[PDB]
């Protein structure tokens, strides 16, 4: 069962690296005039640690089917913070080459949507 290996591993470091890459475009601008006002919130993120993210993904290397399941799990975890439907595009593009970022091989078939 591929699901058994997913529970043992933790994909949180992979999510941080992908979202921090977006970084919300360090420069200013793109302010919506009618955007929500927002307010102070009750609570710096962890370091890059892309090596740690690959180590978690190293388990799902031989099984390409298991690799895609791990990639889709990353999409589900961060499917709420992504807004605008073009930032989600940016998340999907980086997730596809995330196995390519490591020494692993990207799955041939995978549907992130």
């Amino acid at each position, epitope marked *: 069962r591929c699901q058994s290996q997913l529970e043992r591993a933790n994909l949180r470091p992979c999510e941080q690296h992908l979202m921090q*890459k*977006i*970084q919300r*475009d*360090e*420069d200013s601008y793109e302010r919506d005039p009618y955007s929500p006002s927002q307010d102070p919130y009750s609570p710096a993120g962890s370091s*890059q640690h*892309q*090596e740690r993210c*690959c180590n978690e993904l190293n388990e799902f290397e031989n099984n390409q089917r298991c690799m895609c399941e791990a990639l889709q799990q990353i999409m589900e975890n961060q499917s709420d913070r992504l807004q605008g439907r073009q930032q989600e595009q*940016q998340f999907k*593009r*980086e997730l596809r*080459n995330l196995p*390519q*970022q*490591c*020494g692993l091989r990207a799955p041939q078939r995978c549907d992130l949507d």
Partner: antibody, heavy 122, light 108 residues
Framework: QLQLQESGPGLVKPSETLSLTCTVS??????????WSWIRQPPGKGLEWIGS???????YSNPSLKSRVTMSVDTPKRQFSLRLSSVTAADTAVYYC??????????????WGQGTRVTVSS | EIVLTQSPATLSLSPGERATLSCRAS??????LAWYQQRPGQAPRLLIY???KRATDTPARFSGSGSGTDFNLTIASLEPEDFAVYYC?????????FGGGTKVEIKR
């Protein structure tokens, strides 16, 4: 074949901001995991990292040069620009442009530019 | 932040003799290291990536070792083209820095 060609003025006024622009032949600006960096080599001195910029806007620069280094990226033009304000005679160096890989196994500048001799003097 | 120190300032050796170049970083960088060869033709190039793997279009005589703090670059036979200046680069932390630089010259 991927190659990087850099263009810019060879003479820079003392206080005027230096502007440099590199053109990417393979147009991998929009490719993920590719940062675009500038490396300067003072005459008779070792290489020095200026800064690296990504296609999404976020960039990283040298801590000693961050206050004076700003970078821009033009994805349709396949160009990433470097601007260095408040130049000093110590900034005389040969400025390179190199591709910056963000992989775990590749963490180097794989392809470098020819090198443009930029000297600052009145 | 991270400081890369290349202890060998300069070494003089005859062709075909083994040479060892050391790059040391007191803040540990780990497996993340790079090696470059700067020639008078003002064209630095990548030789060793990941501190142990040879780059493309690089002769097999080049070799490197990594341990996190001290790294060694070894060449079996010193061909005449190998006499140049070498720099080491790290990427474990975002403040990327290059080494001081080691120059290898011809014994005479």
């Amino acid at each position: 074949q991927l190659q990087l060609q850099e263009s810019g003025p060879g003479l820079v006024k003392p206080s005027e901001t230096l502007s440099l622009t590199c053109t990417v032949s393979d147009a991998s600006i929009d490719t993920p995991s590719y940062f675009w960096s500038w490396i300067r080599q003072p005459p008779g001195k070792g290489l020095e990292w200026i800064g690296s910029i990504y296609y999404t806007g976020n960039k990283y620069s040298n801590p000693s040069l961050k206050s004076r280094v700003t970078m821009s990226v033009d994805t349709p033009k396949r160009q990433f620009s470097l601007r260095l304000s408040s130049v000093t005679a110590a900034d005389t160096a040969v400025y390179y442009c190199a591709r910056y890989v963000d992989y775990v196994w590749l963490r180097a500048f794989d392809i470098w530019g020819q090198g443009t001799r930029v000297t600052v003097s009145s | 932040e991270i400081v890369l120190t290349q202890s060998p300032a300069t070494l003089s050796l005859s062709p075909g003799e083994r040479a060892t170049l050391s790059c040391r970083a007191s803040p540990s960088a780990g497996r993340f290291l790079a090696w470059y060869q700067q020639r008078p033709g003002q064209a630095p190039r990548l030789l060793i990536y990941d501190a142990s793997k040879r780059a493309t279009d690089t002769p097999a005589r080049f070799s490197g070792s990594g341990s996190g703090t001290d790294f060694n670059l070894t060449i079996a036979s010193l061909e005449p083209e190998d006499f140049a200046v070498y720099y080491c680069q790290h990427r474990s932390n975002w403040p990327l820095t290059f080494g001081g630089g080691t120059k290898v010259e011809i014994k005479r």
